[PDB]
Amino acid sequence: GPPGPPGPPGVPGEAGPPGPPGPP
Amino acid sequence: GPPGPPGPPGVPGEAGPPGPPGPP
Amino acid sequence: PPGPPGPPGVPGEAGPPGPPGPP
Amino acid sequence: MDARSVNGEFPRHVKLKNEIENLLDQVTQLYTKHNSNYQQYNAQAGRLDLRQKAEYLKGLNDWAERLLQELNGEDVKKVLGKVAFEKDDLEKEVKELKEKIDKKEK
Amino acid sequence: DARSVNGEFPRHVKLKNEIENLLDQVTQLYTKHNSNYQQYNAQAGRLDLRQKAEYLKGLNDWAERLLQELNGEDVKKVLGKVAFEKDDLEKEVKELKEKIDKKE
């Protein structure tokens, strides 16, 4: 019997860190 | 031939956008 | 036999907006 | 249960190498993002007062710790604690209700 | 207040320390797992299929036990047992309240 197909893609990454406080 | 496991998680996202402008 | 592991996932979403800037 | 697969133990070896590599990748990315976050903070810090510095650095730390605790299972240990506590009170509830079910046979 | 950034600089260092130490543990696990496969290849010559499987199983068992301690899958398995025991005691209360209040 041949190997099965490749598994599905992995889960998306977590959201990035908060942005900077931004301009005065 | 069952499917393979899911691939690894993605990379975390980029840092968020700057916050809103400060008060005058 | 089982297939190989899948490819990596998509990058995550951008983080939240930062706080308001200073005066 | 095969000879080529060592009764499933060779593909299991490769699976475990994959799982270890993927955790190493996640922890490496966390490490680099945490250090790059501190540079972003150092760059901004010039224009911020102490309270504003602390608010920005706190959110960057909050971000790193939230991810770390998802990778090392400390998030789940905190949940396990809440659930274990809830279980030891529900056990005290069942003991009473089983007694009242026993006595209610009269 | 100012030197520590209201506790957030020592917090940064704590997190860097925790991340470094986990990276160290996972790296060592990775290298030992790969060196274990070489040891297996070296031994395989003198071992019959049942003995090959028994040896490779114990090497895998070793890696997985450590990995699940590092990635918190050991604790997820514990959480599962405890959650099941909680959701069974909830099923017990529902029944006993039905048996006591009605029918008695």
Author numbering:
A (entry chain HHH): 6 to 29
B (entry chain JJJ): 66 to 89
C (entry chain III): 37 to 59
D (entry chain CCC): 3 to 108
E (entry chain BBB): 4 to 107
Cite, word for word, the article reporting this structure:
The M protein is an essential virulence factor of *Streptococcus pyogenes*, or group A streptococcus (GAS), one of the most common and dangerous human pathogens. Encoded by the chromosomal *emm* gene, the M protein is covalently anchored at its C-terminus to the cell wall, covering the GAS surface at high density and acting as an adhesin and a potent immune evasion factor. The M3 protein is produced by the prevalent *emm*3 GAS serotype, which is frequently associated with severe invasive diseases. To gain insights into mechanism and biological role of streptococcal collagen binding, we characterised the interaction of M3 with the Collagen Ligand Collections (CLCs, triple-helical collagen peptide libraries formerly known as Toolkits), and determined crystal structures of the M3 N-terminal domain (M3-NTD), encompassing the HVR, alone and in complex with a CLC-derived collagen peptide.
To increase chances of crystallization, a shorter 24-residue peptide, JDM238, was synthesized which contains the GVOGEA motif flanked by three glycine-proline-4-hydroxyproline (GPO) repeats at each terminus. Crystals formed in conditions containing JDM238 and M3-NTD at a 3:2 molar ratio and diffracted synchrotron X-rays to 2.3 Å resolution. In agreement with our ITC data for CLC II-27 binding to M3-NTD, the M3-NTD dimer is bound to two copies of triple-helical JDM238. While both copies occupy equivalent binding sites on opposite faces of the M3-NTD T-bar, they contact the protein with two different regions ([Fig fig7]). One copy contacts M3-NTD through residues 15-21 of the C-terminal GPO repeats, the other is bound at its more central GPOGVO region (residues 6-12) ([Fig fig7] and [Fig fig8]). The presence of two different binding registers in the same crystal is likely an effect of crystal packing, as this binding mode results in a compact assembly required for crystallization ([Fig fig7]—figure supplement 1), but it also reflects a lack of specificity of collagen binding by M3, in line with the CLC screening data. The M3 collagen binding site includes the PARF region on H2 (residues 94-101), extending beyond it to include the C-terminal half of H1 and most of H2 ([Fig fig8]). Interfaces between the binding partners largely comprise hydrophobic interactions between highly complementary surfaces. M3 residues Tyr96 and Trp103 play prominent roles: they pack against Hyp and Pro sidechains, filling grooves on the collagen triple helices and form polar contacts with the peptide backbone. The indole amino group of Trp103 interacts with the carbonyl of Ala15 or Hyp6 (depending on the register), while Tyr96 forms a water-mediated hydrogen bond with the carbonyl of Hyp9 or Hyp18.
